[PDB]
Amino acid sequence: GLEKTVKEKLSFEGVGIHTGEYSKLIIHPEKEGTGIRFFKNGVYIPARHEFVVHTNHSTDLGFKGQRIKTVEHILSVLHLLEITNVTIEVIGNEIPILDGSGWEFYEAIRKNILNQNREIDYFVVEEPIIVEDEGRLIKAEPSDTLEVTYEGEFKNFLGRQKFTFVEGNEEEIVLARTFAFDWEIEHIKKVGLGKGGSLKNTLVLGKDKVYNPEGLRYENEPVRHKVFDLIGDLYLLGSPVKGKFYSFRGGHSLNVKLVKELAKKQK
């Protein structure tokens, strides 16, 4: 495919899920070969693993004293839409959570796609690789297309389920929201996070119930989101990816680990 970018400036705004603070986005179009980079306080931060400063319950980036929290969703969509050259201006400290999924971005970015005369130089996974971290494991091998599978071993009623994304199936995961278990909320708030969380932006699961009155969108909405997450994380390799990934009980932390140990192979 050819490198892409937005037709014109696009903006989004809302509360950040962790900071609980308001922030605004302004996606700027960029010349070819530019790449994805955020812009905060006159400082450009590249959507590349080198600038990852936090992978707890979000993937945060930073440079020269400027930090942006939760870039996974915005990046994931840009990765799905194969938008390669743009500048994400952030007026705050974290990309807005919106409805908890990548739906709003997708729906708006998709419209304003602008083709360009330059064949995308994809990041190809050249050979098998694995990464562990206590039960948690991710396996990535070579593939003609982008294919990602996530398998969960949920302690609650969800049980063991897994989902698989393949090119042409974006609309199947850009709608999955963010989730957390109830035995998953005190801790988060205590370590100073989720200040913006609510049933309107987050999907809360009980030991065997769903708090949100709106129920689950998909039987396996959680697993889907995790796949969405991984994709966006993977975009930190600096360009659309092409490989076959298997993630069992993954998380941003391990996600990044892979990415780093996957680029450290000068690939």
Ligand X SMILES: CCCCCCCCCCCCCCCC(=O)O
Q: Out of 49, 57, 79, 252, which one is annotated catalytic?
A: 252
Q: CA dist 219 to 154, 216, 240, 250, Å?
A: 13, 6, 29, 19
Tally of CB atoms within 10 A around 155 = 10
Interface positions, 192-231, toward ligand X (CB under 6 A)? 194, 197-199, 202, 204, 211, 229
Residue 176 CA to residue 185 CA, distance in Å, equals 19
Interface map 193-212 toward a copy of itself (x if CB under 8 A): -----xx------x--xxxx
If the CB atoms of residues 44 and 183 are measured against ligand X, the closer one turns out to be: 183
How does 73-104 read in b/e, with b if 16+ C-beta sit within 10 Å?
bbbbbbbbbbbbbbbbebebbbbbbbebbbbb
Task: List the single partner that 239 binds among a copy of itself, ligand X, none, CB under 5 to 8 Å by kind.
Answer: none
Site for ligand X contains 19 (CB under 6 A):
no
Interface map 112-151 toward ligand X (x if CB under 6 A): ----------------------------------------
If the CB atoms of residues 16 and 243 are measured against ligand X, the closer one turns out to be: 16
Which residues are within 8 A (CB) of 61 and not within 5 positions of it... i.e. 6 or more apart?
A: 38, 45, 47, 51, 52, 53, 67, 68, 71
Residue 117 CA to residue 103 CA, distance in Å, equals 28
Q: Which of 185, 216, 217, 260 binds a copy of itself (CB under 8 A)?
A: 185
If the CB atoms of residues 6 and 230 are measured against ligand X, the closer one turns out to be: 230
Interface positions, 130-149, toward a copy of itself (CB under 8 A)? none
Q: Establish whether 73 is an annotated binding residue.
A: yes
User: Of 232, 248, 247, whose CA–CA distance to 49 is shortest?
Assistant: 232
Q: Establish whether 229 is an annotated binding residue.
A: yes
Is 54 one of the catalytic residues? no
Would you tell me which residues interact with a copy of itself (CB under 8 A)? Answer: 182, 185-186, 189-190, 198-199, 206, 209-213
